[PDB]
Amino acid sequence: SPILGYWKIKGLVQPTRLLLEYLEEKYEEHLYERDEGDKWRNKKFELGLEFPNLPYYIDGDVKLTQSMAIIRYIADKHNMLGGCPKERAEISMLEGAVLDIRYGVSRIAYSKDFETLKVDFLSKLPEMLKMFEDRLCHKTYLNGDHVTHPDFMLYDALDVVLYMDPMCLDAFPKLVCFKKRIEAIPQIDKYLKSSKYIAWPLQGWQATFGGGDHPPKSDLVPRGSMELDKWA
Amino acid sequence: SPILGYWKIKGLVQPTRLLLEYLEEKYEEHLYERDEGDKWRNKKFELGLEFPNLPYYIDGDVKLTQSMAIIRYIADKHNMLGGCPKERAEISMLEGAVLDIRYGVSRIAYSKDFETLKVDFLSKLPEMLKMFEDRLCHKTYLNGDHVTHPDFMLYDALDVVLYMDPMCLDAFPKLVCFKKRIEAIPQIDKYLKSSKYIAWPLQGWQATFGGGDHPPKSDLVPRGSMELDKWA
Numbered sequence: 001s002p003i004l005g006y007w008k009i010k011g012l013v014q015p016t017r018l019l020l021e022y023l024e025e026k027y028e029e030h031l032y033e034r035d036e037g038d039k040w041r042n043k044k045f046e047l048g049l050e051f052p053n054l055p056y057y058i059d060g061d062v063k064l065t066q067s068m069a070i071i072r073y074i075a076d077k078h079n080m081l082g083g084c085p086k087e088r089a090e091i092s093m094l095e096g097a098v099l100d101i102r103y104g105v106s107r108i109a110y111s112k113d114f115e116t117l118k119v120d121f122l123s124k125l126p127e128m129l130k131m132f133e134d135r136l137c138h139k140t141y142l143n144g145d146h147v148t149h150p151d152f153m154l155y156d157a158l159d160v161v162l163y164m165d166p167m168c169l170d171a172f173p174k175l176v177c178f179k180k181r182i183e184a185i186p187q188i189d190k191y192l193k194s195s196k197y198i199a200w201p202l203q204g205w206q207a208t209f210g211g212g213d214h215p216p217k218s219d220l221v222p223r224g225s226m227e228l229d230k231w232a
Numbered sequence: 233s234p235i236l237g238y239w240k241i242k243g244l245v246q247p248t249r250l251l252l253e254y255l256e257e258k259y260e261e262h263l264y265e266r267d268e269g270d271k272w273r274n275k276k277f278e279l280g281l282e283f284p285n286l287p288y289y290i291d292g293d294v295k296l297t298q299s300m301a302i303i304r305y306i307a308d309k310h311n312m313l314g315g316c317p318k319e320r321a322e323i324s325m326l327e328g329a330v331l332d333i334r335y336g337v338s339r340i341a342y343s344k345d346f347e348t349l350k351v352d353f354l355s356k357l358p359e360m361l362k363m364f365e366d367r368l369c370h371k372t373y374l375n376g377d378h379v380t381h382p383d384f385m386l387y388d389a390l391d392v393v394l395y396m397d398p399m400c401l402d403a404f405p406k407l408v409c410f411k412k413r414i415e416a417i418p419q420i421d422k423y424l425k426s427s428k429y430i431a432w433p434l435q436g437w438q439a440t441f442g443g444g445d446h447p448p449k450s451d452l453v454p455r456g457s458m459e460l461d462k463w464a
């Protein structure tokens with residue numbers, strides 16, 4: 001199989017994992033664990049990479065790095081990246097828009113003073129999401145009725161964002177419908193329910209959000225109602 | 233012409249600007265100025281965008297947003313994105329690796345306590361760059377002897393990084409050779425020396441680095457030599 005390295009985190013790779021699955025493609029993962037980072041430094045220069053970074057993708061021919069480079073390579077192999085220039089460009093538009101929410105969590109995630117940051121980013125969230133809620137206007141998926149790589153990306157993004165505020169998605173039904181429809185894939189279904197599936201962490205174990213070492217209780221403030229009532 | 237919006241900043245668009253030039257492609261820019269941001273909000277929802285964000289690219293057919301989506305669309309139109317899947321994937325590997333340095337400046341740029349941040353990021357710089365200095369091993373450019381979209385990207389990245397520490401590039405000759413070779417293009421040459429060329433800011437005018445409103449003197453510390461001597 002094509003060999004793939006990452007940390008035992010959802011992180012950047014979750015979407016390529018998801019995509020690898022849905023294609024019924026034999027792949028072998030190289031999963032580094034928090035302590036294991038020792039093992040990384042040595043192999044960091046050995047396995048003939050050109051831009052040695054994680055996540056990596058070893059194959060017969062291709063010897064790749066860079067998260068987009070990996071995903072696009074699987075979907076491209078498969079005829080999913082698009083036919084006609086303009087379409088191919090729309091796909092990456094979707095990709096880009098996706099990666100703002102998911103990279104948006106990333107760019108806050110580790111900052112100690114998360115609590116305060118969360119606020120500002122979340123303020124903007126409803127706008128970013130409406131974009132998709134609107135693009136899901138009489139669509140099964142992002143870019144018509146077939147899956148595309150960015151569908152799993154909005155999925156890793158939505159999966160991520162629910163961990164900030166589980167309620168954030170109630171204002172956008174079609175998005176919730178989207179998450180239900182993705183998982184309804186027999187391939188998505190069985191996966192999320194297997195040994196292989198990395199359910200956490202969401203970020204590197206150092207991270208203030210989607211981090212620590214185990215699935216998330218509070219670390220916060222709620223707001224719910226005036227004095228001592230409503231505590232989500 | 234295909235119409236393109238941004239701020240009167242180098243920023244994200246500098247590379248698409250550079251690429252648009254080298255292709256001898258008629259384009260009309262829509263450049264918003266610092267005060268002008270008023271004009272943005274109204275047109276933000278009017279001009280039939282799907283993911284209304286800056287930079288935008290209006291054409292006959294395509295109505296696009298997202299910085300990668302724009303660049304890749306010009307080069308794709310032109311047969312530059314790659315022939316065979318693996319190659320196309322290497323291109324975006326290059327793209328990705330590029331965008332770590334350039335996004336690396338971005339993610340520090342605005343933080344008030346730049347001075348301190350700069351340190352850490354710069355620490356890592358020589359590693360990131362060696363990658364390219366090595367990939368320039370008996371190459372004219374990134375990915376052989378033809379230009380590719382990422383060549384302008386390493387250019388916008390190197391152009392950017394010299395503004396932190398002008399010396400950072402002395403350890404990597406081939407990179408300096410690269411910058412000389414890019415600019416040697418009659419199209420790059422004439423451009424950088426025209427009315428059209430946005431020489432500054434580098435970031436949004438709010439930014440602590442590559443910002444303010446005008447080309448950069450100090451705001452810093454040097455280190456040069458022990459007590460009061462060597463002040464770069």
Ligand SMILES: N[C@H](CCC(=O)N[C@@H](CS)C(=O)NCC(=O)O)C(=O)O
Pocket residue numbers: 007011012052053054055065066067068204328332
């Ligand atoms: N922009 C990322 C580059 C990767 C990244 O910055 N690396 C992380 C992923 S969690 C890693 O932990 N890097 C360790 C390293 O430098 O060796 C991509 O496209 O994959």
Ligand SMILES: N[C@H](CCC(=O)N[C@@H](CS)C(=O)NCC(=O)O)C(=O)O
Pocket residue numbers: 096100239243244284285286287297298299300436
């Ligand atoms: N990730 C960027 C998205 C753009 C971005 O975050 N926008 C900046 C570029 S300086 C802008 O100022 N945005 C204003 C807006 O939200 O309308 C891309 O691919 O183009």
